[model samples]
Target: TVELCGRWDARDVAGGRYRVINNVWGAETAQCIEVGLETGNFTITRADHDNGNNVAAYPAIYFGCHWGACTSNSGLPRRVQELSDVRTSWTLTPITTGRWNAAYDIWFSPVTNSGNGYSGGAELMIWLNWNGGVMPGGSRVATVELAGATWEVWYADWDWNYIAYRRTTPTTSVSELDLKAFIDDAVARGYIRPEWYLHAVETGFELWEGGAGLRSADFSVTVQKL
Candidate 1:
């Protein structure tokens, strides 16, 4: 038995050995519960915020290394150049009433010291839907098409560099995407190096204002070895 609302409630799931986590890190006045792992699903019943710019919580399903009790290591490859290809996919059924974004919060790290071996590097976000004008950080840097959709790319600086790909049009479902394509593009544009480690790939909702009922279905990732 696990407490669905507990922030530390995490368990392994199907496909790429991903883990579902009750992640409510930014804000806490929300109920982000893990409903299923095998099915790759979760539910957010109540999320209250008014800024329309601040995230209340992110109940995500992660497919890479994450913070843990022992150390910040998932025993996976630490460099993208060591891999042949990486693909990730997901389906989201967002609440039609919330001011949030359905997205994949992907992360990477340089071949050096960072995040207790789990931190630093870049936070690349792929936005499937942007509701209520909930925008990402930075300005529009580029526009490109990937996975049959046009994205207005943006970049910003926080503790780490934030590279965001916001779909020009909102979508609730994504079949699958060769995530390596994005990495390749980033490398071509000099945003990141090819040797950076593709550490974590997560799919979920970033609830901003309200989230009465939001969920994700079929989230998974695969890192192919070269």
Candidate 2:
């Protein structure tokens, strides 16, 4: 049995810089990652090494994102893409926000092209949120994909992009908490190693604003050992 569940604890978050934290570690390991939840209840987990796994882990944990922020084209936000590893492939799809917040789906591939767009690497999926006036562009909330390849989804106050999950592999299991804790944990543990150091996360951005402004926005993911 490889599954976890919990009720979403909702909180009213303003449109600006937001922070999230979680941890995933153990003997089993996370090969794939998947998370789901209602908008507004959960926050996105940074896919940095700390939140994810190391090459020591198998199958490699894949990433995906799913959250809606607004409705109408007038609020469309810009999407920024960043590939820290200079490798991997990704694909971002826009889910209809409808009368509710706008939702975008993101997907990534373990094997991708290199020396091209995005640090000369793969073509990962990316989605831009609607900002102001209507569904056009503004804030950023990244969604990681897990169906095909493993990738990371990240959101900055002024940037939305990608982050590297692991390098060598995983020697432990990944959990909801783990993904949440990735952003600033890996470095603290020295797991990145002094020689290897730490590479920044691949990243991009999408915005959401005005027009009723995301009545709700949430984030979550799950992974399976393949």
Candidate 3:
């Protein structure tokens, strides 16, 4: 196992097909994660921050590019119109004492391979589960059924279109979920444009307090282009 202790420390795993980062961007507090070498899983072992309106950290493992770090053969930067299928499976175990959400962060840019990760277009978050009764950035707009569950849609004009689909019935894992189901829903509501390019698919916890013992057991993403 490899431990990442510093904010922004990262490791490439699974033959460099995936990248894990200690994305502690929001707060100055301490955080650490141990990445299982063979399993590509990660567990948070330390957390200092207590609570905040702004998320303290987004400790994540991702496919595709982030801040110019790209994974091998991730099949990203494909236009939404060309995507035939996009899916993922993820498992996360969280301690009940925390204020956080198990999230899938999907990014879209107006252009492909802009070299800057935050080139700014859209950020779509899928909340598989969350704790503390803390809500997302946006206010509730509506609810929709996707991937065999009901999700409350939230919208906000943040740095970008910060849209979120929060599952009404929270779960810790999805065997393999059709991500396009959520993407399509975003498009149908006019928040995401079909012409935008899919840049990355990132899974992590948006933490606020008591972030210790959050474990991501496994994660995988598949992209099929038409």
lDDT of 3 by residue, 1-226 (tens): 9889998899888898888999999988999999986557999999897756778999999999886678888887889989989989999996888798899998988877747664457899999888888797869999998988999999987666889999998898897799998989999988889999888999999998868999997788999999
**Tens-place lDDT digits, model 1, residues 1-226:** 2337665566666633767776667765646464664565776655554544677777778876654321123445458777777777777776667688888887777744444643457888898885777788888888998767788989886666788988888887776688877787777877766778776788887877776577777776767787
In candidate 1, stretches whose alpha carbon ends up further than 4 angstroms from where it belongs are 1-3, 49-52, 68-75, 112-120
* Local distance difference test values of all predictions, in order: 0.71, 0.23, 0.87
TM value for model 2: 0.21
List, residue by residue over 105-163, the lDDT tens digit for candidate 2. 23222223211222311122222232222321233333334433333343322222333
Instruction: Estimate the TM-score for candidate 3.
Output: 0.96
Sorted on lDDT, best first, the list reads 3, 1, 2
Best by TM-score: 3
Q: Candidate 3: deviation at residue 99, Å?
A: 0.9
TM-scores, all models, native as reference = 0.87, 0.21, 0.96
The order of the candidates by TM-score, greatest first, is 3, 1, 2
Per-residue lDDT value at 178 in model 3: 92
TM-score-superior candidate, 1 or 3: 3
Model 3: C-alpha RMSD to truth?
1.2
